[PDB]
């Protein structure tokens, strides 16, 4: 029927909008990897490291 063809377009537009609204993510993420950290805690790790 005619509403089926319109429903196809609606389904495409909805998925397009959903993909547009999403945020970037990468496997090789930033500090947010663990994260379980705060700015105060990170300085302790930085200062504790000795080469």
């Amino acid at each position: 029927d005619d509403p089926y063809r319109t429903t196809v377009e609606i389904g495409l537009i909805l998925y397009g909008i959903i993909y547009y609204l999403s945020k970037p993510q990468q496997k090789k993420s930033l500090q947010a990897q663990k994260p379980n950290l705060s700015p105060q805690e990170i300085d302790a790790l930085i200062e504790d490291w000795e080469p």
């Binding site: 930033l30 990897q33 990170i42 790790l45 930085i46 490291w49 080469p51």
Partner: protein, 187 residues
Amino acid sequence: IQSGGPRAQIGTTDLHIKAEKLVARFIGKEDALVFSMGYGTNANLFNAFLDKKCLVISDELNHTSIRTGVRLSGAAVRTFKHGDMVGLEKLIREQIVLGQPKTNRPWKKILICAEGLFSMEGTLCNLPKLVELKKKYKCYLFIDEAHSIGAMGPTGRGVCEIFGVDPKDVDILMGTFTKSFGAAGGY
């Protein structure tokens, strides 16, 4: 015109030591070494002191010899965008925090590789910022300067002369004689 062999059994003459001391005094360091080829120098320098547990942070526009040497060494490699120091600092901080892959144990050491003057772009590197970062975060610095050792500077000493930076801040200085001095080799 003939030589004897490797410089550990026969093939060393007083001219070699004279050139050693002359180059060392000219640059401003305390001691030096002279090799017959530059590409081989870079390709064989890195494996002597680097290992699988170390980290190397380098620019994205380095020469091929450095890439080959780092590949032979076997250490991990992270790269940063050309001319960005905020990204470099963020990368250093993150790499210090995270540690080794899959074990999250601390790195043994971190080394920074850069170039004095880039031939494809004709731009200089901001040495003082690198020195400040390495002093603050306790890192090591390696500088490659073959296009700028004889042609640049008020007296031609190199990149360390125009910025006024003391030569003792940088750890290792390298260069080749091909570009400006009319003879082949490196140091």
